[PDB]
Design a protein around this ligand. Sequence first.
Ligand SMILES: [Cl-]
Ligand SMILES: [Cl-]
Ligand SMILES: [Cl-]
Ligand SMILES: [Cu+2]
Ligand SMILES: [Cu+2]
Ligand SMILES: [Cu+2]
Ligand SMILES: [Cu+2]
Ligand SMILES: [Cu+2]
Ligand SMILES: [Cu+2]
Lengths: 336, 335, 336
Amino acid sequence: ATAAEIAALPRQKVELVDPPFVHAHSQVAEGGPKVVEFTMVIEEKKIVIDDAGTEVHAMAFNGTVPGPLMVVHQDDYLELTLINPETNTLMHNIDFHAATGALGGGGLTEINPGEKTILRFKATKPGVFVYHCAPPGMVPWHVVSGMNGAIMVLPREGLHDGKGKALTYDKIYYVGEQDFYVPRDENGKYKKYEAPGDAYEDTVKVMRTLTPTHVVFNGAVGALTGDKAMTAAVGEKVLIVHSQANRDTRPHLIGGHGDYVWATGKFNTPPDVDQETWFIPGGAAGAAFYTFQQPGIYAYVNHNLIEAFELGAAAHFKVTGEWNDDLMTSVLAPSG
Amino acid sequence: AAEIAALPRQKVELVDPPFVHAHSQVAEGGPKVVEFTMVIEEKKIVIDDAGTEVHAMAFNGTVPGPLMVVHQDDYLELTLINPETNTLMHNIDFHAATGALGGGGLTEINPGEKTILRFKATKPGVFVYHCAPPGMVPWHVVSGMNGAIMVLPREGLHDGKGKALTYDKIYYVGEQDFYVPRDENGKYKKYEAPGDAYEDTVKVMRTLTPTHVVFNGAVGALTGDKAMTAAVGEKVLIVHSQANRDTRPHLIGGHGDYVWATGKFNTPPDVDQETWFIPGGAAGAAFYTFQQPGIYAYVNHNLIEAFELGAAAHFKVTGEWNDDLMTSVLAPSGT
Amino acid sequence: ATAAEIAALPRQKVELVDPPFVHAHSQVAEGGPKVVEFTMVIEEKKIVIDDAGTEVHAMAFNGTVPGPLMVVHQDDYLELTLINPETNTLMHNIDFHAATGALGGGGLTEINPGEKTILRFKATKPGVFVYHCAPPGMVPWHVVSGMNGAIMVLPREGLHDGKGKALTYDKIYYVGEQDFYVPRDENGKYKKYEAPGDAYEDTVKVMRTLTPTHVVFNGAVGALTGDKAMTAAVGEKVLIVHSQANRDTRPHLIGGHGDYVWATGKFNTPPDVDQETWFIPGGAAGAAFYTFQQPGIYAYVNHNLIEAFELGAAAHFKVTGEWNDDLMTSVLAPSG
Ligand SMILES: [Cl-]
Ligand SMILES: [Cl-]
Ligand SMILES: [Cl-]
Ligand SMILES: [Cu+2]
Ligand SMILES: [Cu+2]
Ligand SMILES: [Cu+2]
Ligand SMILES: [Cu+2]
Ligand SMILES: [Cu+2]
Ligand SMILES: [Cu+2]
């Protein structure tokens, strides 16, 4: 690419949507390389994360935890306008694991309250990748305050199985998983603070135990359950992108599988197949492809079941369609 | 579904881990209905030499529950019994199964009930099963109410390149994280009912730090009378599961020649593994040919977990020492 | 196979170098199998592990933590002279994960202070592998006192990708990662002890929490930073061997990737590609191959970021060469 060629490329503005939903995109790329433009506004705000009204001073790309999923194709350029409003109190930046150089972009995007920056990078490697804020000297605090998200760099040809056959999903969800480290007082009750900075020393004491107090999808216990369950129909092909910026996880679809799982997140490494539970190390995204076969409620968990059912790491899928008694049947229903 | 009753049926006799019931690696015929029965026992098990107890919630009376073996596309039909002398509702989630929370949504049985579930084993590999009563899921799992099944390919095991892999022995290591409450003196507490230990146990669990990490339900379980045996030249498959917590198996003195670390037989295996990794909520399988005789240890390779918390087993291998592979050129002696 | 055949093979004595450097070696085997001779003296020694001057009685192969990387080729023999000086206080041995029998050699190498031993084993399996001391009854305590290292058994034809094309590195680093469990007093300050034995009971308590006090590269917090930073240039192909004898890790090059990663560390298992963060279980070594594309400072971390930036698991690369604006550019600098 010449200087002539790079400036000549199409620009395309893309509006983000909140997770677990993903902005519209084409799986197979349309036309040649382009510069895909995205804007995100940073919000520091108090969120409630559990049923006892536990508060976090969230630090949120686009106001959500996780940050939204950005979608591009291989050798496109991602050009992000990152804005830190005058209402915030901390400097922030962004590290895309999908980018090369300057600490993922962190070294170039350090913006105080009241400033903006525009970073462009070439998306040379196909896959799902974490991005997170990373101010020097304070990185784990920003990240565990929920300032992280993911992107997906689709291959220009869309996705393929290990023998090169097309894998085309009908829909795509993004589950961002968050470990929170909320300080308690002597009596075991979670503390509240006036400004984010007040909580700093207390939170580090918690971080250093390496034991989160909460492990949550979409920013809170139960954000993806009940009426906010994810949805599919028997016969639909669903891609579930899962990210964890700081800590290991082990996703599992209770009553399903991952028919094809890029556990490492990278689309040039052939997927694993038929998975019960896959493993995503902290600081990575992964993706699982699954065709639903049975209707009903499913759970989708971090299969450390303490983390899933005590600490908040559980979602639902609501699936419509016809039951298949060949796959499974109750021969004799509970009886005595 | 109508034609399942036309298929051959087979009642299996289960055996206690680490042994695996009789079966053929290559499928003997077209799809069958393979039938199993398991009675759930709520019981006290002693987990270390200090007499620490757990309120075990045990499939077939053992932690882990026994290993069921079927072939891809057979139906596994389980009769699961919750005796009237038990206190809790229980059920079964097979990770191998498709629909209704792996069967959990169809098998909730109160003390004094049975149920029979059937599922088509459509995917080849080793899979976790475990109890999953809504509202108290990890309590049941970390009380030892979990096991595994193996769904062999119809044509048996192969490597990545299509070469048949055929074992002489198979063992099943179920690894258990336990969360035993302690008193003010750091003494493990004892209780008289599963229910009475609940909240104390929940508090230990939320620390995410097991007080014990054991094979076959106890420190030293898989040693001495339950040491696993082989001879130089024999090909052994070591099925390993952990229903709730990561492990990193390692055979001390050997390797995993072929490891399906994810547990799934259509994923080509890793080769020449020193230490492999099985995530909480999965099973994996490691294939090795013994080359050297002696006692081997087999460990979770967080060695604090192996050697302080209980996660070590032994293999006992007969045969001829091979000096090409390894020899002591100078025995330990003065400088 | 036979004693005669073994005796007839050429001998080669090799001098070890201190990590993170690796002794001279050739990627493609020069000639046929030989018996490669190494000598390591065990030193029980005081080491400092942070800027606060926290002190550990290390049990160091060759006097370094990790012990040095030994490099052989597949079906060479490795013949280690192990020496335990009369001045030491404990029995030690060596378990090579690369070796077959008698617990990796631990069974044959138990040496009291004032004794030495010579173990020979045949290097049958290509990959990087942990070695560590393992005295029956005090195995973990030796290992998390720093008594561990790695070896690389290269294929005779050198490294290849999954599809049989040669991968030749320009340089190699060995990053040994250590978890330490350092006892604290009633007011949370780290303790000192007069002999290794004095630290025993207190350390065991910290160990059983499974929460390390420090997580470090090359023996100490910041050991691979400043003027000890690893270095490279744009265009340069770097292999990074990373080991962890006791505890998982999830290595990440900040601003970079793992182009080819043998996450399991074994060269007959095809590498993952395009990795953002890879995973190395406790008890293993792994290797990542990367071509630097951009100049500047990188950090190379365990991507549990609390472990990286609170507990010490972060190293730097200094990289010289020309900035590539096509790969990344700051379209708009922080402003407003
Ligand atoms: Cl489940
Ligand atoms: Cl070992
Ligand atoms: Cl990072
Ligand atoms: Cu920030
Ligand atoms: Cu990062
Ligand atoms: Cu139960
Ligand atoms: Cu499960
Ligand atoms: Cu030692
Ligand atoms: Cu070891």
